[PDB]
Amino acid sequence: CSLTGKWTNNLGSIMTIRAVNSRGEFTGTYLTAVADNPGNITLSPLLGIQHKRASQPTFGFTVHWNFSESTTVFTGQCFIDRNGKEVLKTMWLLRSSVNDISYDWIATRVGYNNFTRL
Amino acid sequence: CSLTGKWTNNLGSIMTIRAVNSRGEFTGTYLTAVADNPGNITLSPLLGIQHKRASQPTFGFTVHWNFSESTTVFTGQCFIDRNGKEVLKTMWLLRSSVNDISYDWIATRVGYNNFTRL
Amino acid sequence: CSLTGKWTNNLGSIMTIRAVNSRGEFTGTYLTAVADNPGNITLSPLLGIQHKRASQPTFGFTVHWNFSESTTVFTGQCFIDRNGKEVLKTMWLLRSSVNDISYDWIATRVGYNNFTRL
Amino acid sequence: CSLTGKWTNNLGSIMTIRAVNSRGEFTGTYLTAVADNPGNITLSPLLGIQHKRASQPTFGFTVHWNFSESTTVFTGQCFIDRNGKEVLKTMWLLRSSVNDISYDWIATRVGYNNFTRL
Ligand SMILES: O=C(CCCC[C@@H]1SC[C@@H]2NC(=O)N[C@@H]21)Nc1ccc([N+](=O)[O-])cc1
Ligand SMILES: O=C(CCCC[C@@H]1SC[C@@H]2NC(=O)N[C@@H]21)Nc1ccc([N+](=O)[O-])cc1
Ligand SMILES: O=C(CCCC[C@@H]1SC[C@@H]2NC(=O)N[C@@H]21)Nc1ccc([N+](=O)[O-])cc1
Ligand SMILES: O=C(CCCC[C@@H]1SC[C@@H]2NC(=O)N[C@@H]21)Nc1ccc([N+](=O)[O-])cc1
Numbered sequence: 001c002s003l004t005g006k007w008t009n010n011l012g013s014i015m016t017i018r019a020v021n022s023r024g025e026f027t028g029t030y031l032t033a034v035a036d037n038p039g040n041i042t043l044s045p046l047l048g049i050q051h052k053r054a055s056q057p058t059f060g061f062t063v064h065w066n067f068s069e070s071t072t073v074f075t076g077q078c079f080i081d082r083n084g085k086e087v088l089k090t091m092w093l094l095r096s097s098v099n100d101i102s103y104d105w106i107a108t109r110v111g112y113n114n115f116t117r118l
Numbered sequence: 119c120s121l122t123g124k125w126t127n128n129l130g131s132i133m134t135i136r137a138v139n140s141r142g143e144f145t146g147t148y149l150t151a152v153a154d155n156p157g158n159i160t161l162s163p164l165l166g167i168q169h170k171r172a173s174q175p176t177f178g179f180t181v182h183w184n185f186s187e188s189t190t191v192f193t194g195q196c197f198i199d200r201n202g203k204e205v206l207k208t209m210w211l212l213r214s215s216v217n218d219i220s221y222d223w224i225a226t227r228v229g230y231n232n233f234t235r236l
Numbered sequence: 237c238s239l240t241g242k243w244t245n246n247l248g249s250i251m252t253i254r255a256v257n258s259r260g261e262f263t264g265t266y267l268t269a270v271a272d273n274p275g276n277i278t279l280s281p282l283l284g285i286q287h288k289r290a291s292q293p294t295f296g297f298t299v300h301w302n303f304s305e306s307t308t309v310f311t312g313q314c315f316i317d318r319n320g321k322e323v324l325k326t327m328w329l330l331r332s333s334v335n336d337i338s339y340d341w342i343a344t345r346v347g348y349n350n351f352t353r354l
Numbered sequence: 355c356s357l358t359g360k361w362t363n364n365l366g367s368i369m370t371i372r373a374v375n376s377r378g379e380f381t382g383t384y385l386t387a388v389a390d391n392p393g394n395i396t397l398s399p400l401l402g403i404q405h406k407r408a409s410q411p412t413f414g415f416t417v418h419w420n421f422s423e424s425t426t427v428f429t430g431q432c433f434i435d436r437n438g439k440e441v442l443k444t445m446w447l448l449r450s451s452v453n454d455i456s457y458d459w460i461a462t463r464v465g466y467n468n469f470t471r472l
Contacts, residue, residue, distance in 0.1 A: 011341055023163070023182075025165055034338075034341055034342075045141070045167070047143055047166065047180075048180050049165050049180045050182075051187060051189070051215075054187055057187075057215075058215050059180075059189055060180030060181070060182075060190065060191040061191075062166050062177075062179060062191070062193070063178070064141075064169065069172055069175075071167070071177055072178065073179075073180070073191035073192065073211070074191065075180070075189055075190070075212075075226070077222070077225065079218065079219040089222045091211050091464060092211075093191070093211060094193075095177075095178070095193040095195060096176070097175075097195060098195065100174075101207065104195070106345065107207075108209045108346055109344060109345050109346070110228070110345070111466070112465070154460070211464070224463065226465060227462060227463050228346060228447070229327070229348070229462060259418075281377070283401055283402065283403050283416075284401065285416045285418040285425070286425075287418065287423060287425070292451070292454075293451075294423060294425040294451050295416075295425055296416030296418075296425045296426065297427075298402050298413075298414030298416060299403075299414070300378060300405065300414075305411075306412055307403070307405070307413055307429055308414065308429070309415075309416070309427035309428065311426070311449040312449060313449060313452065313458070313461065315455040323455065325455065325458045329414075329446075330429075331431060333410070333411075333431060334431065336410075336433065337435070337441065337443065340431070340443045343431065346464070
């Protein structure tokens with residue numbers, strides 16, 4: 001349950017995460033399989049923090065989409081089953097860019113993602 | 119709309135964001151006014167990314183609570199009003215640590231926060 | 237804290253709730269101040285249930301928009317302050333209609349609303 | 355994609371929904387497989403509205419838990435695949451009862467559920 005490594009989710013997206021430092025911080029790269037405009041998809045950086053001591057840590061990360069003005073955050077927990085298989089159970093918020101504060105109500109989508117190791 | 123500086127929210131929490139780098143990455147600290155167990159609250163680190171080009175950027179950040187096994191992620195947009203006042207409109211997910219995957223359904227809280235500058 | 241009566245929220249929307257029955261069921265109407273296409277807004281029906289015994293009951297309701305294929309659900313709690321003023325604190329999910337299951341990930345928005353009496 | 359009938363979800367919960375009327379309104383009964391205190395689980399009524407014309411309608415419903423002061427709302431869309439199999443793709447908010455308005459921030463959980471016909 002070090003987030004380091006390569007993962008895929010139920011939508012077919014993949015992400016790679018680099019070494020987790022002593023503070024639990026990590027960087028990585030996210031390839032979404034889906035977007036509002038999938039023709040525009042490019043690789044997008046992520047940055048987050050996990051807990052370090054827990055065997056099944058909670059964590060969060062931000063994805064700065066490099067092809068959109070939007071941002072997504074993911075949070076979840078890494079679980080290990082009887083056979084040692086890891087799953088990241090996550091929920092996310094996807095924030096759209098709107099023109100002014102009077103449109104704020106329409107700007108936040110929610111969903112889930114389950115990730116397993118590639 | 120650089121997130122650098124000190125901010126307070128509607129619950130009375132305060133966060134301090136350091137320099138935003140050329141990628142839009144930032145670190146800082148978060149002092150929550152509230153918690154499951156407020157007697158345990160300690161200053162906690164945050165790490166996130168904002169968009170750089172946009173005058174009213176979207177952003178995300180993760181708070182690793184230093185007194186809990188939980189994690190929060192925030193995402194939102196920084197708006198500049200006609201008088202130049204900045205407001206962060208955010209939504210958040212708070213992930214609790216549970217014992218095993220059968221409890222995953224109970225583990226994610228959602229809410230909002232509006233921040234203005236200190 | 238009977239939801240019967242007229243209420244307004246922070247976005248300026250108004251809803252009117254009819255008699256709450258002995259099960260806590262209620263119907264009413266909802267006039268949203270905002271929409272994807274505000275030129276199309278029409279008064280829309282709502283249907284929900286509140287708890288009956290509690291002085292500060294939790295509740296939920298569904299709004300079937302009469303001008304959209306979307307649906308919103310609201311859930312929250314009615315609080316009575318020390319002066320007897322009632323506030324509904326709510327969160328909502330707004331479900332859009334998409335063409336097929338491959339688009340399901342894009343279809344759910346989240347937000348808040350605070351209501352007070354008219 | 356009439357919600358009428360018997361359904362189960364990914365957590366093992368079941369629900370039965372009665373006839374949907376001409377306004378799209380329906381009642382039913384929900385048996386959750388999980389709860390904060392599963393020893394207390396009893397059958398709980400639901401009340402909601404679906405859209406009528408759409409082949410793959412959106413909908414919402416409220417579950418008034420009969421063993422808790424909490425309430426859940428579900429919203430989603432009913433999809434039909436090439437072989438005629440129905441799936442309800444839903445997101446939910448679970449509202450807890452808290453003592454006063456200053457605890458409101460902790461009171462709303464979010465998640466998903468996928469339902470198929472029994
Ligand atoms: O499309 C985008 C950017 C890419 C988002 C991919 C999401 S992240 C949650 C989910 N999990 C995945 O692995 N991938 C999806 N942004 C966007 C979408 C819609 C709108 N809009 O205005 O409707 C604006 C920006
Ligand atoms: O209490 C905690 C850790 C601190 C969370 C503070 C939240 S972050 C969203 C909101 N905005 C703020 O400025 N402050 C609040 N975690 C926690 C809470 C509940 C449970 N639980 O099991 O119920 C477990 C851990
Ligand atoms: O616009 C709509 C229908 C009206 C929704 C009003 C929302 S209910 C939550 C909030 N509280 C209020 O009082 N009013 C707002 N639906 C819609 C919106 C966006 C999209 N979309 O595709 O982006 C599709 C349908
Ligand atoms: O436990 C409860 C009542 C039952 C909730 C069942 C949920 S509905 C979303 C999900 N889908 C299912 O089919 N079943 C689950 N309420 C509750 C839970 C936690 C707390 N709390 O304070 O932590 C208070 C009330």
